[PDB]
Hints:
By secondary structure, this protein is α/β, with parallel strands linked by helices. The chain has helices at residues 41-46, 65-76, 92-108, 126-135, 143-158, 163-170, 176-190, 196-215, 262-274, and strands at residues 14-16, 27-30, 51-54, 86-90, 116-120, 226-230, 247-251. Helices cover 43% and strands 11% of the residues. The ligand *[P@@](=O)(CCCCC/C=C\C/C=C\C/C=C\CCCCC)OC is lined by residues 32-34, 91-92, 127, 130-131, 134-135, 146, 149-150, 153, 207, 210-211, 214.
Amino acid sequence: NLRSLLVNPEGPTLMRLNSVQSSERPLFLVHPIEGSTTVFHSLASRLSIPTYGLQCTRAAPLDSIHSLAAYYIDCIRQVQPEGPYRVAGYSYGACVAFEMCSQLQAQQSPAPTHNSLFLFDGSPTYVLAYTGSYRAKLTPGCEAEAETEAICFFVQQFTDMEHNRVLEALLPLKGLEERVAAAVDLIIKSHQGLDRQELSFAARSFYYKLRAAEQYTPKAKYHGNVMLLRAAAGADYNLSQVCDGKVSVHVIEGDHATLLEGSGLESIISIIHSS
Ligand SMILES: *[P@@](=O)(CCCCC/C=C\C/C=C\C/C=C\CCCCC)OC
């Protein structure tokens, strides 16, 4: 459903995803690349702990994953001022969640830290694998081509349009803003009822989200423990390279998308409740 690929750019960053009321510290869930928390609805409805989502709105600083993570920590502190924190992220959000817990590690130091980090099918290197495959198609150092490729991909998620006619429409344009405007007009032609400003924000932010992920490396190894629940990047999605604590891995049924529903979901729920 296409509006699941959209965010209200003026919506709240932190959102309560279930109605559990207790003194148990909440679980905070970080969005996948599209920025919305829709993918977490089934999980949140089932969890017995208060559950919040983080969505990516116009207010989010996207200059780096470092900045995005710091902003999300500021947001979480409006409901839970002190740790320890329970944070999970899915896909693109796994890298953000990793960086959030890394910043929490470094902030609560030198005191021993006890945060819980769950990565649902992602890691600091997970997005990079995707971006490199597309970079392979492009003239080195040509920003215009990278913008074009990203925005073309975006259009193809919202329309049945053929790749080359969209690429060719976007390539010669003046800059990102013109590419975004062209993309939104193409999507609106197909889907007249979608919101123009939601689409514009989604398109622009898609490019900046990808740039931030491409440029990201952790500042230091994470010393806390990590639970990877996953569907080359290898068995642990390269986490041993950036973690000096325990990296526990469990393989969940489904693909990169269905793991948060059906069978995968039952496993995730069980592991959250135990660990
Ligand atoms: P997850 O959040 C998926 C995480 C990976 C998302 C990236 C997937 C595809 C990238 C598509 C196009 C990028 C093309 C341009 C290459 C240059 C990069 C631009 C900065 O699950 C939803």
